[PDB]
């Protein structure tokens, strides 16, 4: 339980790291979730992408 | 602004604890502007002295 | 993040369309005139001095 | 030739201003993307 007083110990006793944390924490979270949707997608669909076309370079 | 009849700050000590605060007497149509002024000046002691 | 998604989606739809960007580079020809005179010919939406 | 003289006057703003004018225009000049969005804003601004 000692991380709960220590995390309030440092940052939010004023609006210093409040309207800056919620902005910068909106980014690491938006990139943590865009990364996991973009890897559950290319694992459900193997052999179905555009770069998996066997005759791609050669039309002639 | 005449928003009370009387106002008093207290401070009590005991062997392990204590009490710090404000006591006030007022008319029933002044209780909003009186409660704003009490809480504004107690919290200001932590910011701007 | 929800205010971030909505405001960008409304402001980016005003930028430039995929059919406007497809007409942005091509090859056209001119004709001849004598030394010191003026004739223009069109390329995309503007002239060639 | 009045919408050309005024909307290109925002191309002298520092170095985000060449991205302002081609976003206001919707292209590389005044054309049908500009006439269509000038009509939508003109029904809206008298009610503000």
């Amino acid at each position: 339980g000692g991380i709960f007083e220590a995390l309030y110990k440092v940052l939010m006793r004023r609006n210093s790291v409040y309207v800056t944390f919620v902005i910068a924490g909106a980014f690491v979270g938006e990139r943590a979730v865009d990364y996991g949707v973009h890897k559950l997608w290319e694992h459900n669909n193997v052999g179905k992408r555009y770069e998996d076309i066997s005759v791609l370079g050669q039309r002639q | 602004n005449e928003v009370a009849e009387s106002m008093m700050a207290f401070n009590t000590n005991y062997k392990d604890t204590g009490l710090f605060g404000v006591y006030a007497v007022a008319k029933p149509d002044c209780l909003d502007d009186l409660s704003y002024a009490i809480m504004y000046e107690t919290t200001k002691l932590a910011y701007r002295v | 993040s929800l205010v971030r998604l909505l405001i960008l989606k409304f402001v980016l739809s005003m930028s430039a369309s995929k059919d406007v960007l497809a007409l942005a580079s091509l090859e056209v020809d001119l004709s001849s005139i004598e030394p010191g005179t003026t004739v223009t010919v069109k390329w995309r939406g503007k002239p060639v001095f | 030739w009045g919408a050309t003289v005024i909307t290109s006057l925002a191309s002298a703003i520092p170095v985000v201003g060449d991205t302002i004018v081609t976003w206001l225009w919707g292209g590389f000049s005044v054309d049908n993307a500009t006439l269509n969005r000038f009509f939508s804003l003109h029904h809206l601004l008298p009610f503000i």
Binding site: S16, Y18, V19, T20, F27 | - | - | -
Partner: peptide, 29 residues
């Protein structure tokens, strides 16, 4: 007191820059 008022108040100028490039990445300037 009054220094700590502004010594706070100029980091919301900067909480707002962590915020001002957070969505738009104003690039050329």
């Amino acid at each position: 007191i009054q220094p700590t008022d502004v010594k706070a108040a100029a980091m919301w100028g900067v909480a707002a820059a962590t915020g001002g490039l957070y969505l738009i990445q104003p690039w050329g300037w």
